[PDB]
Amino acid sequence: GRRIQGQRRGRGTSTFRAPSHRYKADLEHRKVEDGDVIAGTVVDIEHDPARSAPVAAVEFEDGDRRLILAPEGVGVGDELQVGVSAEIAPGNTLPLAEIPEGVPVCNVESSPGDGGKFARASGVNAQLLTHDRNVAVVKLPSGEMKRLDPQCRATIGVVAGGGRTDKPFVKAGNKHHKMKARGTKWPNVRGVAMNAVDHPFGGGGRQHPGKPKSISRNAPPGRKVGDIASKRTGRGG
RNA sequence: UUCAAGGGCGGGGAGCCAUGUGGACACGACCCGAAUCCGGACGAUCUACGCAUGGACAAGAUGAAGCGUGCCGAAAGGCACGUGGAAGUCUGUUAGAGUUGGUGUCCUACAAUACCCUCUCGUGAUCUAUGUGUAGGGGUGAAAGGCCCAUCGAGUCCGGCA
RNA sequence: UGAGGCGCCCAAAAUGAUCGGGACUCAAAUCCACCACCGAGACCUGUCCGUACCACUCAUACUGGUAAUCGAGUAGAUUGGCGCUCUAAUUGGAUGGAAGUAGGGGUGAAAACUCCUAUGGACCGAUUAGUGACGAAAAUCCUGGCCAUAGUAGCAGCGAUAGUCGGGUGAGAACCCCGACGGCCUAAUGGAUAAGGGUUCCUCAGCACUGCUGAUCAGCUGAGGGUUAGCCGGUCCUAAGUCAUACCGCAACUCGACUAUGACGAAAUGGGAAACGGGUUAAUAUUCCCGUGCCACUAUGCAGUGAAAGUUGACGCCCUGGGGUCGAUCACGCUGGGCAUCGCCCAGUCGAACCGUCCAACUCCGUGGAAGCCGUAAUGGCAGGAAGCGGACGAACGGCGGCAUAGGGAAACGUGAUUCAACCUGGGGCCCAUGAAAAGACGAGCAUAGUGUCCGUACCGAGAACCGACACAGGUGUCCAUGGCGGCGAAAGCCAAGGCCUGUCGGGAGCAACCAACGUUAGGGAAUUCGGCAAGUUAGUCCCGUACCUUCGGAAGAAGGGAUGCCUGCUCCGGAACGGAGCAGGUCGCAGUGACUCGGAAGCUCGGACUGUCUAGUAACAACAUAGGUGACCGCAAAUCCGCAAGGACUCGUACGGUCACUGAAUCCUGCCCAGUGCAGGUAUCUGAACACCUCGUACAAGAGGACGAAGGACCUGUCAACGGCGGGGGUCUUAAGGUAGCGUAGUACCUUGCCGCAUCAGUAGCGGCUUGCAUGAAUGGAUUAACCAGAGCUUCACUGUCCCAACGUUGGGCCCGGUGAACUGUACAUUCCAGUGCGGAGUCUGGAGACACCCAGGGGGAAGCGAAGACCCUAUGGAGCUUUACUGCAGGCUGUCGCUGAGGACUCUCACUCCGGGAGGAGGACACCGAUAGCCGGGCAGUUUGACUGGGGCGGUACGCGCUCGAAAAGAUAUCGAGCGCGCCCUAUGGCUAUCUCAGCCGGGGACCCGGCGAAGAGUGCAAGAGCAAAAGAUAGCUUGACAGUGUUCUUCCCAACGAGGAACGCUGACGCGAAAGCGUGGUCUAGCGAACCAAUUAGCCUGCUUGAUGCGGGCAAUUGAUGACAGAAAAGCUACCCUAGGGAUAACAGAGUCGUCACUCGCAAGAGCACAUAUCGACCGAGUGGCUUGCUACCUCGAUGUCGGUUCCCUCCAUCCUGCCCGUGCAGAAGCGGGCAAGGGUGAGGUUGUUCGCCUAUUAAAGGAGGUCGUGAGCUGGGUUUAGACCGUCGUGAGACAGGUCGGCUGCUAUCUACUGGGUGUGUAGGUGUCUGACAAGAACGACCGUAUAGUACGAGAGGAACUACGGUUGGUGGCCACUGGUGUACCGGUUGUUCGAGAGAGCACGUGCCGGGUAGCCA
Ligand SMILES: CSC[S@](=O)C[C@H](CO)NC(=O)/C=C/c1c(C)[nH]c(=O)[nH]c1=O
Ligand SMILES: [Cl-]
Ligand SMILES: [Cl-]
Ligand SMILES: [Cl-]
Ligand SMILES: [Cl-]
Ligand SMILES: [K+]
Ligand SMILES: [Mg+2]
Ligand SMILES: [Mg+2]
Ligand SMILES: [Mg+2]
Ligand SMILES: [Mg+2]
Ligand SMILES: [Mg+2]
Ligand SMILES: [Mg+2]
Ligand SMILES: [Mg+2]
Ligand SMILES: [Mg+2]
Ligand SMILES: [Mg+2]
Ligand SMILES: [Mg+2]
Ligand SMILES: [Mg+2]
Ligand SMILES: [Mg+2]
Ligand SMILES: [Mg+2]
Ligand SMILES: [Mg+2]
Ligand SMILES: [Mg+2]
Ligand SMILES: [Mg+2]
Ligand SMILES: [Mg+2]
Ligand SMILES: [Mg+2]
Ligand SMILES: [Mg+2]
Ligand SMILES: [Mg+2]
Ligand SMILES: [Mg+2]
Ligand SMILES: [Mg+2]
Ligand SMILES: [Mg+2]
Ligand SMILES: [Mg+2]
Ligand SMILES: [Mg+2]
Ligand SMILES: [Mg+2]
Ligand SMILES: [Mg+2]
Ligand SMILES: [Mg+2]
Ligand SMILES: [Mg+2]
Ligand SMILES: [Mg+2]
Ligand SMILES: [Mg+2]
Ligand SMILES: [Mg+2]
Ligand SMILES: [Mg+2]
Ligand SMILES: [Mg+2]
Ligand SMILES: [Mg+2]
Ligand SMILES: [Mg+2]
Ligand SMILES: [Mg+2]
Ligand SMILES: [Mg+2]
Ligand SMILES: [Mg+2]
Ligand SMILES: [Mg+2]
Ligand SMILES: [Mg+2]
Ligand SMILES: [Mg+2]
Ligand SMILES: [Mg+2]
Ligand SMILES: [Mg+2]
Ligand SMILES: [Mg+2]
Ligand SMILES: [Mg+2]
Ligand SMILES: [Mg+2]
Ligand SMILES: [Mg+2]
Ligand SMILES: [Mg+2]
Ligand SMILES: [Mg+2]
Ligand SMILES: [Mg+2]
Ligand SMILES: [Mg+2]
Ligand SMILES: [Mg+2]
Ligand code: NA
Ligand code: NA
Ligand code: NA
Ligand code: NA
Ligand code: NA
Ligand code: NA
Ligand code: NA
Ligand code: NA
Ligand code: NA
Ligand code: NA
Ligand code: NA
Ligand code: NA
Ligand code: NA
Ligand code: NA
Ligand code: NA
Ligand code: NA
Ligand code: NA
Ligand code: NA
Ligand code: NA
Ligand code: NA
Ligand code: NA
Ligand code: NA
Ligand code: NA
Ligand code: NA
Ligand code: NA
Ligand code: NA
Ligand SMILES: [Sr+2]
Ligand SMILES: [Sr+2]
Ligand SMILES: [Sr+2]
Ligand SMILES: [Sr+2]
Ligand SMILES: [Sr+2]
Ligand SMILES: [Sr+2]
Ligand SMILES: [Sr+2]
Ligand SMILES: [Sr+2]
Ligand SMILES: [Sr+2]
Ligand SMILES: [Sr+2]
Ligand SMILES: [Sr+2]
Ligand SMILES: [Sr+2]
Ligand SMILES: [Sr+2]
Ligand SMILES: [Sr+2]
Ligand SMILES: [Sr+2]
Ligand SMILES: [Sr+2]
Ligand SMILES: [Sr+2]
Ligand SMILES: [Sr+2]
Ligand SMILES: [Sr+2]
Ligand SMILES: [Sr+2]
Ligand SMILES: [Sr+2]
Ligand SMILES: [Sr+2]
Ligand SMILES: [Sr+2]
Ligand SMILES: [Sr+2]
Ligand SMILES: [Sr+2]
Ligand SMILES: [Sr+2]
Ligand SMILES: [Sr+2]
Ligand SMILES: [Sr+2]
Ligand SMILES: [Sr+2]
Ligand SMILES: [Sr+2]
Ligand SMILES: [Sr+2]
Ligand SMILES: [Sr+2]
Ligand SMILES: [Sr+2]
Ligand SMILES: [Sr+2]
Ligand SMILES: [Sr+2]
Ligand SMILES: [Sr+2]
Ligand SMILES: [Sr+2]
Ligand SMILES: [Sr+2]
Ligand SMILES: [Sr+2]
Ligand SMILES: [Sr+2]
Ligand SMILES: [Sr+2]
Ligand SMILES: [Sr+2]
Ligand SMILES: [Sr+2]
Ligand SMILES: [Sr+2]
Ligand SMILES: [Sr+2]
Ligand SMILES: [Sr+2]
Ligand SMILES: [Sr+2]
Ligand SMILES: [Sr+2]
Ligand SMILES: [Sr+2]
Ligand SMILES: [Sr+2]
Ligand SMILES: [Sr+2]
Ligand SMILES: [Sr+2]
Ligand SMILES: [Sr+2]
């Protein structure tokens, strides 16, 4: 047949790329020499096109003006700290080691100095549970217990924008505007609604997948559609 | 070949070459005739979708939240009037976009998709110009096997090829 | 009373009857005899030719001879000859005229040869041997040329109907120019431009070309000329993004991703230093010239030490205040014009950049001191300091002054105001959406001077300059969005400025038919139709008023009702408007939203929630999307995806994420099933590859086996909002469960027009209910639902030419004339008609009939008309797209192993390598990544296959390999999807021999046993059938292994007649068994029980392997076993309605033709009953027929096409008669029924469901008959059904997909040549004229039917009931004609009146061929 939509994606053509030339900044933690002698002042709160959440512009002591992944409760004028000796206050960044157990953090680094990888979406937060000399245990938004190098930096507090998901889009037009700010092809035509040549589920008088939807992990691209390697399906049992 | 026998093939000198001609096989194989398949190229001046930078939307209707005033209330609030001006909101041949019916006109046409009346949309998932990107078993597709320069259930050109 | 001959009745069909026709009756019939004739290419006969044979001969050269026993021919075989080109040898012709061509003479059976004459003006032969791009009637053959078509179609149709009278120029004027009059265009038909074009621009001179006619004209032809820039674009900047170089990949590159660098990337329309006004030319113009001004850089001078922080460039959508120019309008003045019953109407009244100055808003400061005040259109503001007062900063493309005794104007050369586009500046609101960047500029003075180069510059910008082959009704961006009236308006309509008469052929006919657009139609009012399709109705604004239902938004403009102008004088709101809302009085019309503009309304049901999307070019929908619901994967060194790789999208993203899927708003809900399939997890044991390891084997190696065992599978578990499933049976069974809530005859229900009800005169429709559901049912989502809809169906009110039933009118065509001027199509002939025949669907054949030639107009019956090598169907060892547990492979994923890879069946470490980090360093780590290989998964991808037979194909079946009987016609051979029926083995005895013996069955004596008798065979002999067999071929007993090895002959397979395996009969040789021996035994009495090559295993001996020997392991001769049943041998599944090609009437669908079982109709016989009575009437059985209306059968015609059903319109016919006329019978009193006969003149109608045909139903009727004409009628109409592509449901299928099952949508080309006919002409014939006739023939339905009255309340009859003859009056259908009457029309005409323009008035134009309304003459009509 013809390559399915999931295969057109990988080519990274315009239709599938994110509007990067419109994105603001890479909200990675600042790189400090050591000591924590780095402080800045929240100079402004801005909208972040790539995450539908707010971001804060900070002016650091040494003269660096950088956008920051802002937690909830940060406002203009407030002073933020980034370093091993930073104060344990919402909005400050420091290694997990320096963080008191039982404190919600966000923008947690995967590997020390990478800039942050976990808990960066609207209103989410990781939960630092255990400390140690070799391993800091964090509970991520998905609820999974993650073991991290205690040298991994994080920001105290939860991410700004919480509850963004509580309000329904109501209209296709609203979904539309948001989708235009992402790297996604939208709207979505059902596989069952296409011709056999276009999808494993296409074809047949009435619409229906002429096959079970749970597909093997080993399936090749073009065939791996439907419920990928499902451990189970439905709501029952 | 055969204990044995019986079979098979060959045996008392005619061939070799040349020229014409009958016929066979591979090759285009008496000549034309068709839908393919493959290779390398050329096309996004059409069109599909995305992106960049610009542009367009008379007038009218309806009257959301919010706010106000008055009365009622212990309060919560309620009611009335006003204000306000929301909306993939209504009417609209505004610009602009489209095309339900006439199965009208035309059907060697004005036109290889046109004409007229009726009809639908017209502040938005809107329409539109230019630039720009995606290329052939590949694009693009709110999916009709639609569209990729009058051609697409696999473009076009030349070649494979007689 | 029997028999025979001829005839009669039985006896009905569709355009015109037939024996070929005429026509025939003591025959021109039939039968019995006879007589004489005609009539082939036969037969006889003369001459000649060919061929064969004979004699003579070198001869196949002559000559002679023979043919009763020779003379036709498609495919094909054989052989002699004609012509063409060039070569060679030999030999000729030609300027005293070659070849060729044209006409003509001669020869040859013919191919073809030759001569004469004319033309021509230079080459041309013959013989012989060669050479070959050597011969055309044909291929929808190719190219060129040409005729008919035809002086034909077009030069009309579009909301842009456009001209006319004079004159000018010229050889020539409808369309070239001037004037007048008349018109057209207003977001365009005007002005400026982008792309694109490229000289189209201007001038002069032209008209052969181009131009829908003409042309003096031009976008055409000839010749010249024309585009002038510091300040308008380019140039500069960067955008999405592109390229180049470096680096890396790649076999490689002109290929490819990242990362660096550099460059490229915006001409209307992104950012951006600076120019305005006027004048000038045939054509340029912010470019030239005049005046005035400005910017940048540089130099000099003065000033200045500031200089980079900040600001700007620089920004979304929606609402809105304020400032404010142009425009427009109002008031008054000035200048000029127009009009002249008034006193009005029009135009103008100007003046830039720039320099200078003014500042509202915003922000902030001082003062002040609000505890309730300040403020807005609105929000709002304040002791964190309100108002008020003062102040800093601070705007216009704006005001003001200069510019300006610049410019411009004939002149005047204004002044104020309102509403205010541009432009300036604020306030508010929205985002799961956040609305560029960079160069540059400001920051940062002034004088004077110098420099400011390079490229573009014309013109069109479109119903003739662009793209569409065109001077194409198409397509094509920007701005002019503020000209006047109008009105809500950037709407309509009318009119300016400006443009045009080129959406470019004209002339003529009261101008016919017919067609395209359109106006008006009495009464009825959807009767029309599949369907109100088409048309119409309603309409603007204000007031009153407004249901069910509802998600409380809506429904809603629901519905329904009323008002509407003008004039006079006023009130209210507001600062006011040339803004708005009202009042009082007066008054006109048919009509006051007067034209124009401008909704018809209501209810029920189905679907999809909604806005949105889509098949460019037959589908706009119920399909796609959607928010909402849900499930799946993934912690980021991730999941998913692209790349061979280098690398990459997602991703400046991180679970409130984003990937993969399903369902499809809300609301109420979403049951049972984990057996199969899918996914996932687990797994003692089982199974499970390669490397390494072990055993055997090999001096080694091949190889055989073993141990170990990953993923995977077995096995267990989880999982259905995972594929899917939820039946039959009984009061469980398959295969897990056995259908719960709901809904239900459904867009799903075959039966089916289900049944009841509603509604209608009548309702296959629709709605409600019932419901056992052929075959509903829960995210394959169920139910339900307000709102929405060019979605499907139904009903009602209103309205109407849809209809009854048509008419009249308008505009453009049509017709005639001038000019211009195609195409389609053409084997030939062609004046046809009725029958027949023929490959069964004829203008051309046969027989008749008719027919004087030509032309004009017409509507289209026929030419199975033209257009397209049928899209249907089948066939082909065709193609393609699609599917899958088809065949075979390939990517990809998982997994083991080896290399990378290091040190000390579980472990530590660091040093390769990986990742994080700017770095130090951290994390990990011999793993991972990568290379190689092995096992598993693997329609994600590729190549293929998927057979044949067949009363078409499919399904079914196998007549696909074998044996028997019959078919089979007495040798042999012989078909069908012919009839009956078998074989794919079985048997160590059920084989072989020998000995002894005789069987079924019946009878007699003591179903077992014993004895006797009869008994040619009916028994038995493995299994079909047919055949064979009795001291046996059977039975019993005993013995035995011949069911043996080798090798042939022959026949069969395969008649004749070639073909393999297989088989049989008969031999020779060897070895045996039994018998006294002859002899028997090559399996079972005979005919079925079967399998190639390649390969393997096996048996015995031998041959052989690359210089040589040995060993291993191979190659071969002969043969046995292993299978191909599609059985003389491929390894092999489907869909296509998205389809494509080659062909086929070799094969189907409709139709024709044949048949006539079926169907319709009739007849013979007459049982039976009809109270008695066969026959008033009904009528079984059985028998005999006719038709060609039903159906089936066949495959004869057609696949280079003969368009389906139904309807409609229009014409002809048949009779088997429904009515009407005339009769006969009756179980006929009458009236009326019932049955029958003659008879085809006429009639046979309107409606409800349904596409229907049919049929059911309703009211009428004399009756409301049936059938043929290609199931008459699409070059006539329709397009509802059927029958393409889109989509849904039920059922089927793993799936693609399928289903005379249902459902919504879905294209109808052509200018008539011939013929035919309706009408109209011109000629010829009869044979200069006028007028009047005849009547062969021809057409008619010209008339059909009914009601009523008198007869008569009579005849008849107890009564009830109730006729006729005849004479009358009227109605209806049909027919022909006419307009006094009634009615319609009446774009003659007269009137009323709305908007607008001409100043008013008067009088007029436009508002589509009347703006609208009223009346209406002639004429035409019903
Ligand atoms: C020129 S061919 C005309 S068609 O054959 C006309 C005939 C009329 O009987 N129609 C049919 O035969 C229709 C057959 C159909 C069949 C077999 N199957 C279907 O599903 N639908 C049909 O219409
Ligand atoms: Cl989202
Ligand atoms: Cl000859
Ligand atoms: Cl320019
Ligand atoms: Cl304001
Ligand atoms: K055919
Ligand atoms: Mg970041
Ligand atoms: Mg996008
Ligand atoms: Mg979807
Ligand atoms: Mg589809
Ligand atoms: Mg597929
Ligand atoms: Mg383009
Ligand atoms: Mg209001
Ligand atoms: Mg574009
Ligand atoms: Mg010679
Ligand atoms: Mg020739
Ligand atoms: Mg003609
Ligand atoms: Mg001239
Ligand atoms: Mg000019
Ligand atoms: Mg024109
Ligand atoms: Mg009427
Ligand atoms: Mg009818
Ligand atoms: Mg209509
Ligand atoms: Mg007032
Ligand atoms: Mg229905
Ligand atoms: Mg919809
Ligand atoms: Mg279409
Ligand atoms: Mg539509
Ligand atoms: Mg969803
Ligand atoms: Mg769906
Ligand atoms: Mg849907
Ligand atoms: Mg019903
Ligand atoms: Mg369920
Ligand atoms: Mg579904
Ligand atoms: Mg064909
Ligand atoms: Mg087909
Ligand atoms: Mg194929
Ligand atoms: Mg890295
Ligand atoms: Mg395939
Ligand atoms: Mg092949
Ligand atoms: Mg076949
Ligand atoms: Mg015989
Ligand atoms: Mg084989
Ligand atoms: Mg063997
Ligand atoms: Mg065979
Ligand atoms: Mg074909
Ligand atoms: Mg034939
Ligand atoms: Mg046939
Ligand atoms: Mg035809
Ligand atoms: Mg009769
Ligand atoms: Mg009687
Ligand atoms: Mg008649
Ligand atoms: Mg017919
Ligand atoms: Mg016809
Ligand atoms: Mg037709
Ligand atoms: Mg026609
Ligand atoms: Mg229909
Ligand atoms: Mg489809
Ligand atoms: Mg069908
Ligand atoms: Na092929
Ligand atoms: Na393009
Ligand atoms: Na309100
Ligand atoms: Na339309
Ligand atoms: Na292709
Ligand atoms: Na012959
Ligand atoms: Na031709
Ligand atoms: Na000024
Ligand atoms: Na003209
Ligand atoms: Na809309
Ligand atoms: Na299961
Ligand atoms: Na079901
Ligand atoms: Na809609
Ligand atoms: Na009419
Ligand atoms: Na005709
Ligand atoms: Na195909
Ligand atoms: Na086959
Ligand atoms: Na059959
Ligand atoms: Na044999
Ligand atoms: Na018959
Ligand atoms: Na009659
Ligand atoms: Na009917
Ligand atoms: Na026909
Ligand atoms: Na018809
Ligand atoms: Na038609
Ligand atoms: Na028809
Ligand atoms: Sr990052
Ligand atoms: Sr980083
Ligand atoms: Sr499917
Ligand atoms: Sr469940
Ligand atoms: Sr483009
Ligand atoms: Sr709207
Ligand atoms: Sr239509
Ligand atoms: Sr119409
Ligand atoms: Sr057309
Ligand atoms: Sr509208
Ligand atoms: Sr195309
Ligand atoms: Sr070729
Ligand atoms: Sr002969
Ligand atoms: Sr002969
Ligand atoms: Sr030739
Ligand atoms: Sr001609
Ligand atoms: Sr005209
Ligand atoms: Sr036209
Ligand atoms: Sr001339
Ligand atoms: Sr010109
Ligand atoms: Sr550039
Ligand atoms: Sr610009
Ligand atoms: Sr204003
Ligand atoms: Sr110009
Ligand atoms: Sr222009
Ligand atoms: Sr145009
Ligand atoms: Sr004018
Ligand atoms: Sr002209
Ligand atoms: Sr009239
Ligand atoms: Sr009707
Ligand atoms: Sr009707
Ligand atoms: Sr359409
Ligand atoms: Sr729902
Ligand atoms: Sr399972
Ligand atoms: Sr039930
Ligand atoms: Sr005609
Ligand atoms: Sr058949
Ligand atoms: Sr025998
Ligand atoms: Sr199947
Ligand atoms: Sr289909
Ligand atoms: Sr034909
Ligand atoms: Sr008769
Ligand atoms: Sr009668
Ligand atoms: Sr019929
Ligand atoms: Sr019926
Ligand atoms: Sr039907
Ligand atoms: Sr169907
Ligand atoms: Sr239809
Ligand atoms: Sr004569
Ligand atoms: Sr009477
Ligand atoms: Sr009486
Ligand atoms: Sr008029
Ligand atoms: Sr009106």
From Swiss-Prot:
Additional record remark: This protein can be partially incorporated into E.coli polysomes in vivo, indicating it can replace the endogenous protein.
Task: Please give the name of this protein.
Answer: Large ribosomal subunit protein uL2
Specify the superkingdom: Archaea
Question: Whom does it interact with, and what assembly results?
Answer: Part of the 50S ribosomal subunit. Forms a bridge to the 30S subunit in the 70S ribosome. Interacts weakly with protein L37Ae.
Pfam families linked to this entry: Ribosomal_L2, Ribosomal_L2_C
List this protein's GO terms for biological process: cytoplasmic translation
Query: What Gene Ontology molecular-function terms does this entry list?
Result: rRNA binding; structural constituent of ribosome
Q: Which UniProt keywords apply?
A: Ribonucleoprotein, Ribosomal protein, RNA-binding, rRNA-binding
State any GO CC term. cytosolic large ribosomal subunit
Where are the annotated coiled coils located? none
